[PDB]
Amino acid sequence: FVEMVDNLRGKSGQGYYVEMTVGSPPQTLNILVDTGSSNFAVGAAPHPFLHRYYQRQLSSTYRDLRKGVYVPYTQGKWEGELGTDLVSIPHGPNVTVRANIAAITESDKFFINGSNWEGILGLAYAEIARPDDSLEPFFDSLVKQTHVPNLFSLQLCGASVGGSMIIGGIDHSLYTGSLWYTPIRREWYYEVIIVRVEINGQDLKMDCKEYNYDKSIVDSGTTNLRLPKKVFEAAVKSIKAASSTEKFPDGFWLGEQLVCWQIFPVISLYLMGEVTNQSFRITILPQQYLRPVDCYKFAISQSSTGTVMGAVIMEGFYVVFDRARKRIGFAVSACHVHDEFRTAAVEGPFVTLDMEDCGYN
Numbered sequence: 001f002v003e004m005v006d007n008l009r010g011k012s013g014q015g016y017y018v019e020m021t022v023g024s025p026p027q028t029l030n031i032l033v034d035t036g037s038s039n040f041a042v043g044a045a046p047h048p049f050l051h052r053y054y055q056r057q058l059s060s061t062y063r064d065l066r067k068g069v070y071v072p073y074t075q076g077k078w079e080g081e082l083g084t085d086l087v088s089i090p091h092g093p094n095v096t097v098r099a100n101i102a103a104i105t106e107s108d109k110f111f112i113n114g115s116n117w118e119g120i121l122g123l124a125y126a127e128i129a130r131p132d133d134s135l136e137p138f139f140d141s142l143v144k145q146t147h148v149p150n151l152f153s154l155q156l157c158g159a160s161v162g163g164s165m166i167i168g169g170i171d172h173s174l175y176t177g178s179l180w181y182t183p184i185r186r187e188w189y190y191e192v193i194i195v196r197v198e199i200n201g202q203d204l205k206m207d208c209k210e211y212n213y214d215k216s217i218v219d220s221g222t223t224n225l226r227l228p229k230k231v232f233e234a235a236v237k238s239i240k241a242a243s244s245t246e247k248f249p250d251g252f253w254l255g256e257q258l259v260c261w262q263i264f265p266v267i268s269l270y271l272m273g274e275v276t277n278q279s280f281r282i283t284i285l286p287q288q289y290l291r292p293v294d295c296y297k298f299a300i301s302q303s304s305t306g307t308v309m310g311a312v313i314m315e316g317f318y319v320v321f322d323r324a325r326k327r328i329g330f331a332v333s334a335c336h337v338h339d340e341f342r343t344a345a346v347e348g349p350f351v352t353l354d355m356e357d358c359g360y361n
């Protein structure tokens with residue numbers, strides 16, 4: 001999978017995108033890689049922020065589904081017109097798939113001014129696709145129509161960002177040590193179960209249900225580590241404690257301020273393993289959750305929809321979305337940023353009882 005190496009670009013905080021083609025003849029677009037959504041949606045109108053857009057009138061293979069779709073978010077939205085067309089990934093597998101495409105015709109606070117992408121590739125499952133789960137997501141269409149294996153893996157290496165999306169396989173050059181797998185609890189988001197959290201080696205001693213209150217997901221579309229409020233409150237209280245050599249205001253912890261200088265504690269997440277009463281832990285450095293924006297912001301925030309393992313987690317690990325076996329693999333990434341005193345790590349096995357009780361119902 002050599003030519004798929006380094007097929008991801010982007011800017012800090014603006015997500016990772018991959019090059020794709022749509023229609024016949026092929027129209028090239030940069031498309032965000034997003035494991036937290038399930039729609040393949042592309043700009044189709046000359047929005048002033050867009051470098052380019054889907055021009056359906058130029059594609060002989062375009063087919064109109066004659067149905068709109070409306071996707072609101074927190075004060076933002078995009079909406080579009082559903083259709084199908086031929087889709088390829090130039091630095092991916094050598095195949096061409098007919099996939100659903102949502103031609104974005106109206107949006108608000110969706111496209112980013114100054115960014116270099118024009119659409120979004122939802123890699124999650126049909127259940128959270130809009131308008132309903134009958135709109136087959138792209139990767140499902142890819143797997144059904146070709147012999148590409150039902151998995152993909154992501155190495156996000158956080159000016160410009162870089163990374164690799166390996167469609168249908170695993171490139172063992174992109175990680176060190178062994179892969180450790182956590183089960184996909186349910187196929188809608190990429191939902192997983194955190195069973196224990198440690199700050200600098202010290203457990204938070206919270207009922208593990210809180211770590212997954214509502215849910216916990218793996219999301220390449222989210223920048224930060226998003227923890228439930230009560231877990232976030234307890235998490236920052238511990239990170240605050242080990243960080244007494246230097247005192248910042250309270251608002252900096254809620255995402256309100258940056259400071260440069262031109263000692264922090266490591267965060268450990270224990271994930272449910274593949275075997276009863278067996279878990280493993282992934283540990284990230286300060287180089288992950290303190291994102292430069294030599295200045296840096298604090299990239300851990302609270303959430304209402306559960307835990308979100310975003311780029312702060314994924315940029316330290318090679319992550320394997322093993323859809324065929326309903327599991328997610330983690331391994332130390334060969335590109336993660338680390339000093340010479342501490343390293344990102346994936347360790348196991350550990351003994352953890354009542355891991356199923358950690359999931360919310």
Ligand SMILES: Cc1ccccc1-c1ccc2nc(N)c(CCC(=O)NCCC(C)(C)C)cc2c1
Binds near residue numbers: 036128219222
């Ligand atoms: C921010 C926003 C504004 C207008 C339209 C869409 C978006 C949007 C697009 C894709 C997203 N993809 C994501 N993975 C996320 C974060 C995770 C999340 O809440 N997913 C829920 C489902 C859905 C992504 C809203 C469809 C938020 C997103 C927000």
